[PDB]
Scaffold this motif. Structure first.
Motif, PDB file in Angstrom:
ATOM      1  N   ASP B 155       0.850  -1.190   0.000  1.00  0.00           N
ATOM      2  CA  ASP B 155       0.000   0.000   0.000  1.00  0.00           C
ATOM      3  C   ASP B 155       0.881   1.234   0.000  1.00  0.00           C
ATOM      4  N   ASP B 156       0.814   2.033   1.076  1.00  0.00           N
ATOM      5  CA  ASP B 156       1.470   3.352   1.108  1.00  0.00           C
ATOM      6  C   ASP B 156       2.973   3.203   1.195  1.00  0.00           C
ATOM      7  N   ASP B 157       3.417   2.284   2.039  1.00  0.00           N
ATOM      8  CA  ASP B 157       4.831   1.971   2.148  1.00  0.00           C
ATOM      9  C   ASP B 157       5.393   1.532   0.796  1.00  0.00           C
ATOM     10  N   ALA B 158       4.631   0.716   0.067  1.00  0.00           N
ATOM     11  CA  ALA B 158       5.007   0.282  -1.278  1.00  0.00           C
ATOM     12  C   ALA B 158       5.195   1.466  -2.200  1.00  0.00           C
ATOM     13  N   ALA B 159       4.233   2.386  -2.192  1.00  0.00           N
ATOM     14  CA  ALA B 159       4.306   3.604  -3.024  1.00  0.00           C
ATOM     15  C   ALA B 159       5.458   4.492  -2.623  1.00  0.00           C
ATOM     16  N   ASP B 160       5.668   4.665  -1.324  1.00  0.00           N
ATOM     17  CA  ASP B 160       6.826   5.424  -0.829  1.00  0.00           C
ATOM     18  C   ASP B 160       8.146   4.777  -1.198  1.00  0.00           C
ATOM     19  N   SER B 161       8.210   3.451  -1.169  1.00  0.00           N
ATOM     20  CA  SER B 161       9.438   2.739  -1.484  1.00  0.00           C
ATOM     21  C   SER B 161       9.752   2.715  -2.972  1.00  0.00           C
ATOM     22  N   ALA B 162       8.724   2.535  -3.801  1.00  0.00           N
ATOM     23  CA  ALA B 162       8.938   2.229  -5.216  1.00  0.00           C
ATOM     24  C   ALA B 162       8.759   3.384  -6.195  1.00  0.00           C
ATOM     25  N   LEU B 163       7.895   4.346  -5.876  1.00  0.00           N
ATOM     26  CA  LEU B 163       7.522   5.355  -6.875  1.00  0.00           C
ATOM     27  C   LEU B 163       8.268   6.682  -6.698  1.00  0.00           C
ATOM     28  N   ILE B 164       8.795   7.195  -7.801  1.00  0.00           N
ATOM     29  CA  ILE B 164       9.430   8.513  -7.859  1.00  0.00           C
ATOM     30  C   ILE B 164       8.470   9.644  -7.429  1.00  0.00           C
ATOM     31  N   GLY B 165       8.924  10.493  -6.508  1.00  0.00           N
ATOM     32  CA  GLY B 165       8.101  11.602  -6.015  1.00  0.00           C
ATOM     33  C   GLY B 165       8.704  12.978  -6.242  1.00  0.00           C
ATOM     34  N   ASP B 166       8.728  13.783  -5.180  1.00  0.00           N
ATOM     35  CA  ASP B 166       9.154  15.203  -5.226  1.00  0.00           C
ATOM     36  C   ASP B 166      10.637  15.394  -5.527  1.00  0.00           C
ATOM     37  N   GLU B 167      11.429  14.340  -5.324  1.00  0.00           N
ATOM     38  CA  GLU B 167      12.886  14.384  -5.494  1.00  0.00           C
ATOM     39  C   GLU B 167      13.335  14.419  -6.953  1.00  0.00           C
ATOM     40  N   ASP B 168      12.413  14.111  -7.860  1.00  0.00           N
ATOM     41  CA  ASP B 168      12.698  14.097  -9.296  1.00  0.00           C
ATOM     42  C   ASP B 168      11.354  14.268 -10.010  1.00  0.00           C
ATOM     43  N   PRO B 169      10.709  15.453  -9.828  1.00  0.00           N
ATOM     44  CA  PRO B 169       9.286  15.718 -10.141  1.00  0.00           C
ATOM     45  C   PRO B 169       8.915  15.582 -11.608  1.00  0.00           C
ATOM     46  N   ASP B 170       9.904  15.695 -12.486  1.00  0.00           N
ATOM     47  CA  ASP B 170       9.705  15.512 -13.918  1.00  0.00           C
ATOM     48  C   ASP B 170       9.334  14.068 -14.287  1.00  0.00           C
ATOM     49  N   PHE B 171       9.695  13.125 -13.407  1.00  0.00           N
ATOM     50  CA  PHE B 171       9.448  11.703 -13.641  1.00  0.00           C
ATOM     51  C   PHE B 171       8.665  11.039 -12.503  1.00  0.00           C
ATOM     52  N   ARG B 172       7.871  11.860 -11.811  1.00  0.00           N
ATOM     53  CA  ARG B 172       6.959  11.429 -10.751  1.00  0.00           C
ATOM     54  C   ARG B 172       6.092  10.281 -11.266  1.00  0.00           C
ATOM     55  N   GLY B 173       5.976   9.226 -10.462  1.00  0.00           N
ATOM     56  CA  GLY B 173       5.153   8.086 -10.828  1.00  0.00           C
ATOM     57  C   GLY B 173       5.963   6.988 -11.490  1.00  0.00           C
ATOM     58  N   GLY B 174       7.197   7.288 -11.862  1.00  0.00           N
ATOM     59  CA  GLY B 174       8.068   6.260 -12.419  1.00  0.00           C
ATOM     60  C   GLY B 174       8.730   5.428 -11.341  1.00  0.00           C
ATOM     61  N   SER B 175       9.543   4.479 -11.761  1.00  0.00           N
ATOM     62  CA  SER B 175      10.325   3.691 -10.845  1.00  0.00           C
ATOM     63  C   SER B 175      11.607   3.241 -11.540  1.00  0.00           C
ATOM     64  N   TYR B 176      12.430   2.513 -10.800  1.00  0.00           N
ATOM     65  CA  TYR B 176      13.608   1.872 -11.356  1.00  0.00           C
ATOM     66  C   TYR B 176      13.556   0.412 -10.999  1.00  0.00           C
ATOM     67  N   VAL B 177      13.772  -0.437 -11.996  1.00  0.00           N
ATOM     68  CA  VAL B 177      13.708  -1.859 -11.789  1.00  0.00           C
ATOM     69  C   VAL B 177      15.021  -2.537 -12.170  1.00  0.00           C
ATOM     70  N   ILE B 178      15.395  -3.531 -11.368  1.00  0.00           N
ATOM     71  CA  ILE B 178      16.552  -4.370 -11.629  1.00  0.00           C
ATOM     72  C   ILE B 178      16.083  -5.830 -11.681  1.00  0.00           C
ATOM     73  N   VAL B 179      16.531  -6.552 -12.708  1.00  0.00           N
ATOM     74  CA  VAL B 179      16.244  -7.979 -12.843  1.00  0.00           C
ATOM     75  C   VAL B 179      17.542  -8.767 -12.794  1.00  0.00           C
ATOM     76  N   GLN B 180      17.506  -9.943 -12.172  1.00  0.00           N
ATOM     77  CA  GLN B 180      18.578 -10.926 -12.306  1.00  0.00           C
ATOM     78  C   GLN B 180      17.963 -12.315 -12.287  1.00  0.00           C
ATOM     79  N   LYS B 181      18.236 -13.074 -13.335  1.00  0.00           N
ATOM     80  CA  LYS B 181      17.843 -14.481 -13.420  1.00  0.00           C
ATOM     81  C   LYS B 181      18.830 -15.386 -12.686  1.00  0.00           C
ATOM     82  N   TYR B 182      18.397 -15.943 -11.567  1.00  0.00           N
ATOM     83  CA  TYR B 182      19.243 -16.821 -10.785  1.00  0.00           C
ATOM     84  C   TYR B 182      18.938 -18.287 -11.050  1.00  0.00           C
TER      85      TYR B 182
END
Ligand code: HEM
Ligand code: HEM
Ligand code: HEM
Ligand code: HEM
Ligand SMILES: [Cl-]
Ligand SMILES: [Cl-]
Ligand SMILES: [Cl-]
Ligand SMILES: [Cl-]
Ligand SMILES: [Cl-]
Ligand SMILES: [Cl-]
Lengths: 309, 308, 308, 308, 309, 308
Positions: B155-182
């Motif tokens: 919920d809110d913690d998820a949104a706070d953890s994952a979604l771009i906010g006021d710190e980079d307002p041009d890309f608000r709502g975005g995220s950064y993802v990393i994948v590794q196939k183990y």
């Protein structure tokens, strides 16, 4: 609100567990209790994550006596022990409880497992004084055979009724919950005709339709639990009652649980039910239902709950 | 969030599809790829609407190199290629990928179908470089046999953890993802006692209960992936890992995928995992798991994705 | 989103009940109608609460003329009776209707029971002029065999398209809904090839993929119902169409229902469909489908509906 | 087998109810009890028909003493009271019970309701002596954390194992059931390593795979409950065990229930469990589990039940 | 037939796993293989019991070459290796396989877990030569977009078609199963109109209705796989085909699996499909589908399977 | 039991389609009807197979008179047109019908689609005279608010009651089915108290418990439909009644359908209901319910139906 503690607004579930505990007298006991309830998100996810649907929830309530042992200087506006009531024949006793866990899920095993982890984490620091395993009974009915929860407010109205707001900013998003374990006299209730039962409740039995104005007794469950202030503003509570029982001990029960931003509303509904409006004009459901417990708890928001200690 | 692209906060699903692609060098390839990903709501609805429940989701990621080809002017604050790590024993390679499609549904057929339409539409403009078909394994476990995802924020913690906010307002709502196939060494893992495995992870196996403070090893997976700043504030990531495998090739895998509003959080978990904290005290999970891939993508919000 | 009337933004359901009623000319009639609809949350909860999942929903629509009898002092900016259309080949009739009850649930019984109770509570004060029992048909298809509802706006897009906003603040959260009970010429539709049928609709039939720009007829249902204004901005409606039918009377219908913050969008759509764009270039869907009704209603927000 | 009494071969359910009763001494009590159990299809259908799926089942057992009160003339070949066992460390008591109702459904409410109706109908003619509300625990596990029921025979093997045939043709279709309510010492169980627990049971814990021959201890639960006659033929029982408990009374239980066409099979498992094979080599499961009850009932077929 | 091996008659499922293995040359290898397949009820229950619904099933098939290594003196009447076919442009190759496991469940994890336990039990004694993870595709469709399995016989007819009877008493209740992994040319198939595709198959695409007699090509999939003997008696097979594929390698496939009491019926259907009736009048589905494998197995009844070794 | 026509013994379904048709007097008509119904497994599989659960079923009934046009040489022992009844207050009309299609599924769409295809394939050769869309109403109730179908025979009992046996060997596995489309007087039924309603039916309303012998009226629906012969032997029918209705036409119905190995049982039931026992002592259900149709059909076994 997936797997977050203090989700007061969850819709009804097939299974529930109500646990009421009393905390030990010691400082160690107080610290253990705090450690467990303030970290309650741990057991919640540990159990709940295992079900894909994420139906499991856990609301922690804290009693007034215990609150003052741990947060002496900051206190929600209306936190006090349950106010007992004595009518001439029916009473609402005030019984012990420092901790409430109101646990809900789509399955029994999930409720049981979380209760198991919670009790295990508390060990000697707390004692279970009441335990009720709630279950959905047919089409959302109680053991009296009436649909139970119909007029509950939902969505925004649920938030308005149940959750602390601008009136008490330091505890915004918290709630006040009251529990009463009721046991029914099934025999005596079965001697009434459906039509009489409908007059007691205020709604038709099978179809769950509100009795129209001119057929609605002044002492029906519905009339007495309708709360309109002087300004003509309606005041609601959010209820999550569940059936429970034991066939061998002949217990057939309704576990009342009700949430409000101000327990004054719940308290007045109870006063009307037990003492009447006008006086003596009491709720006849109480001729068939006897409260064995009565406890009030403060439901802190997640932020406040996490800070305890 | 029903049938909307870039729904980073979707809960776990029974099935998922992870597609990693490299785009063609030509300006035409660039335009095809951009046309497809910018209109991704089309295929998403075309497949997804067919299920009453509407469980289908699709998150599009873009690599740093490809991003520069299409939006040379504005960049998300933290977009860069995946940083390889060489630890004392194990290494996390950095492998190619211009595009990520992270697809989730209640049913394999919806994932597969969305994948089919997307690949079809991209034609010669892109190539599939990694493809894994993830699946729920019993009660939310990975193939190591542990419940995997327990402490995800919600919920809110998820949104706070994952979604771009006021710190980079041009890309608000975005995220950064990393994948590794183990891929796992199952027989080695099985030589450990359950208690040993529990010490490696940091949680009891069947019951999924975190080890208490005094039984938690300093090199446990949980310990090393705990990120607490100097003000005492924890920083969390959002993971959507799934099991996968092939019984014939003896492949038994965990496909790791982690979202964060700042990938430095994820990256620091990786460094602490591969190099150790203190150095040398690395994650024993890596003694039984080998990452075959490693790639970082930016996850543009719908608005930004739609204008690419 | 549970058991609250006027929930416009509800996802597709397996069952539907569309009720259209005309009010009595009387004053008791006007009053009974007002008591029933202003307390619609009563019967909605009375029925809905019986189902654990709480799928039951109910949108109440009020016709322009009956609105005037009940709230003359205050009126939504774009309320009016359904503008009928008479075009080259086909016509959209404006038919009678004061009250619309748009009912949806996971089950038929819940729809019918709610309907039963709304009808009983209105008694002689109102009369049913159109009753339609909508049903889900395979993978979200209409009886023409095409997936019906695919490009519906969702979530925030759906709110922006359907719900009255800053432009009419006294009625914020309300909507305008147009219904049309279409009946199909099945044998004539079946003489078409699949590829011709796809040309008529604008999408591939089995796969529900939108035709490429170069293959897309200027008179396909999709192009004609696409609305882009002079600034390049798109305008959308939210539809909840359902199949219905009777085998012995050989009726095979699509019950059309669409919601917008402004009926002008729906009305333009209907003009482009019936009149054609350019004129004469009309929606070929209309060759196999005949509107037997046509009615507009205002959907009051929950606040506005409860005081009436 | 839909809503038929005495359906011994029903698969596992999410919920169950185990009711053990003693009948009154009077001839009137005998007749009431006989009237109720002989017409048990009434309450069974009265409750059960209310669920579309029809998952509700009810198996009625009769104790040896009560059987003699009602059918002095003909007895099933093997009906006798439960035989207590005193082992070197643990004992299985024999406790009262004239009637067993083994009730199973997909939902608690159906079990509870059937129980309610049955108890109501029996009134003063009987008393509930044991009552436990069983429940499925994760992926078919018991509270010891092991998958419980794995090797139950199924289909034809189940019928061959559990149902009376040509060997006692007067009671063909009946069975014999034994119940024991076990309570566990959870903290003692948890001092064991997973490997230790696996050796006690005879199967791996998470993965539920039988230990191979050379790792299987001679006193494992599985070993001791393996019954092979002199001709090399295995003899199996059918178990429907469920978890139960009370968190306040610190009760964590397994309610054992086992059906067999010849209870000597079940009894021999019990002897081998409690006294050991060889003597002294007893089932370590009993070091963490204590039976609070022990009772044997005959399960008459529908025909025989209906004529009592 | 809850959690019993060799349940040939199970209805279709959401997930399947087809594993084809070749047994090692040694006597140890032959004994291990026997030990595993004859005790296959072990892994089946070990995995399947964990799902309340009990949807998991596992059919073991044994190839003719391997059968003769282990049961030299008792052999079902029609057990032989898959008969290859070569038409002028399309062929049905005959590819290796001593063991088939045809595993089905409502969930992928269950199929995967059983395959994992089975492969683990065999270790070095056998090698996987083919592995296909089948999945239901929409409303029982194949990747060609047609409903796949419609005319399968059910209940008693399924038993009659699929299961060995009085003709071969020693193996009553066994079956003969043939597999072929087909890969589709999706591009070429998409260049056909729906109406053409319907002529290839013999049924309407969306509605899955059989083309009437006078519009039904003599070379349609349906016509060529209709088997009527001289006495006018119809002969059916039981099929459980499933979609499979890999988006990166561009594989879009149909895994054909068909069961019959006598593989002569399946063999003749194949002969008609590949060589035509009349000759050259072949099944056009093969213009869009190319078989990469072809293997026949004997499916012993539970009793015979348990005896092996 | 999957996708085989003439499956009489199928459990309750959430949806139902009852179609009654009359045949053309022609010879092509007789032939088209025969092709469609003798190959009914075709459309049944064509529709049913699309649903994973395979819930779709279809029982075909043939009226006595049309049977004669099609198989004069051979006839079931008890085939004849529906015997109409004219009693003290209420009458059961014998209405027209050659073909009955009794269709059930978990979903409406499957019912309708099967219906669509049976109708299309018959074309001009037959005409729909009665179409009813049955639905499950709450916990297996009829629109009178009582649980409807409770005492239905099940499994072996159901087979013995419904399916032609040794007594008519040429038609073994067939059945006789009577339909009656009842419509209710809702307002009149609602003027009764619950206890009066219980007296009429024979069972408690909410709890669905059969009244005690001493409280059971001699004219309750239950007593009147209870059949015990001179040897003390009971005779039962298998019913699959479903609710149906239309709100605007104010129809609220129970569509009665009952199957028996011998219509004499159903016919006695109907006599006791309409005429009364003793005479004049009729079924009070009939005061609130009026049969609008009345038709008998033979249900051929699958073999007999396929050769026709
Ligand atoms: C034996 C205990 C109780 C039983 C069986 C019972 C049962 C019911 C039933 C059947 C209804 C009608 C459906 C609905 O929930 O709207 C109802 C309504 C309600 N009850 Fe209770 N109740 C019990 C205790 C209480 C108590 C102790 C309170 C107050 C503290 C309470 C407050 C309410 C309220 C506020 C309503 C909604 C009234 C309205 O606005 O329509 N109930 N109850
Ligand atoms: C072989 C691959 C991996 C496996 C099998 C694995 C498994 C697990 C398991 C069983 C848990 C405990 C349950 C839970 O809370 O999810 C866990 C926790 C976690 N893992 Fe992993 N993991 C893997 C890779 C990674 C990687 C690469 C990262 C970081 C980039 C990561 C970050 C985390 C985090 C942040 C937690 C929660 C820690 C906490 O706050 O309690 N994992 N993982
Ligand atoms: C504390 C009570 C008990 C517990 C916790 C328990 C647990 C288990 C477990 C985990 C298994 C392995 C899974 C399976 O195949 O079911 C098992 C097997 C079995 N148990 Fe029990 N059990 C209990 C009591 C009993 C009793 C009293 C009996 C006999 C009267 C019994 C007879 C069996 C049998 C026959 C098997 C299958 C053995 C085989 O052939 O592999 N159990 N039990
Ligand atoms: C690429 C491979 C195949 C595809 C895509 C395919 C597809 C289909 C489809 C769509 C149908 C109509 C629905 C139904 O199942 O009744 C069908 C029917 C059938 N197919 Fe296949 N099939 C394939 C391979 C085979 C093979 C190799 C055989 C024979 C060994 C076969 C035998 C049959 C049979 C017996 C029917 C039923 C015909 C009838 O009696 O109506 N199929 N197939
Ligand atoms: Cl619980
Ligand atoms: Cl996929
Ligand atoms: Cl309806
Ligand atoms: Cl219970
Ligand atoms: Cl698999
Ligand atoms: Cl229908």
């Amino acid at each position: 609100a997936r797997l977050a503690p203090q989700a007061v607004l969850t819709p009804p579930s097939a299974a529930s567990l109500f646990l009421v505990l009393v905390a030990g007298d010691s400082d160690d006991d107080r610290a253990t209790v705090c450690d467990v309830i303030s970290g309650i998100d741990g057991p919640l996810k540990a159990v709940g994550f295992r079900e894909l649907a994420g139906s499991l929830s856990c609301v922690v309530g804290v009693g007034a006596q215990f609150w003052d042992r741990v947060s002496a200087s900051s206190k929600p506006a209306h936190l006090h022990p349950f106010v007992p009531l004595s009518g001439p024949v029916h009473s609402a006793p005030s019984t012990p409880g420092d901790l409430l866990f109101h646990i809900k899920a789509a399955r029994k095993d999930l409720c049981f497992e979380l209760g198991r982890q919670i009790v295990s984490a508390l060990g000697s620091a707390a004692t279970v004084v009441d335990e009720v395993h709630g279950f959905r009974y047919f089409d959302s009915r109680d053991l009296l055979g009436f649909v139970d929860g119909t007029e509950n407010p939902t969505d925004d109205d649920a938030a308005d009724s149940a959750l602390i707001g601008d009136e008490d900013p330091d505890f915004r998003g918290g709630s006040y919950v009251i529990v009463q374990k009721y046991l029914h006299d099934m025999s005596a209730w079965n001697t009434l005709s459906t039509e009489e039962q409908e007059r007691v409740i205020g709604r038709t039995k099978l179809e769950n339709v509100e009795l129209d104005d001119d057929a609605q007794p002044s002492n029906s469950h519905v009339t007495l639990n309708t709360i309109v202030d002087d300004d003509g503003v309606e005041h609601d509570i959010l209820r999550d009652a569940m059936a429970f029982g034991s066939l061998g001990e002949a217990e057939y029960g309704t576990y009342f649980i009700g949430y409000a931003k101000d327990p004054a509303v719940t308290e007045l509904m109870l006063r009307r039910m037990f003492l009447g409006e006008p006086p003596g004009n009491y709720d006849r459901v109480l001729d068939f239902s006897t409260a064995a417990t009565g406890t009030l708890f403060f439901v802190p928001s997640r932020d406040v709950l996490e800070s305890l200690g």
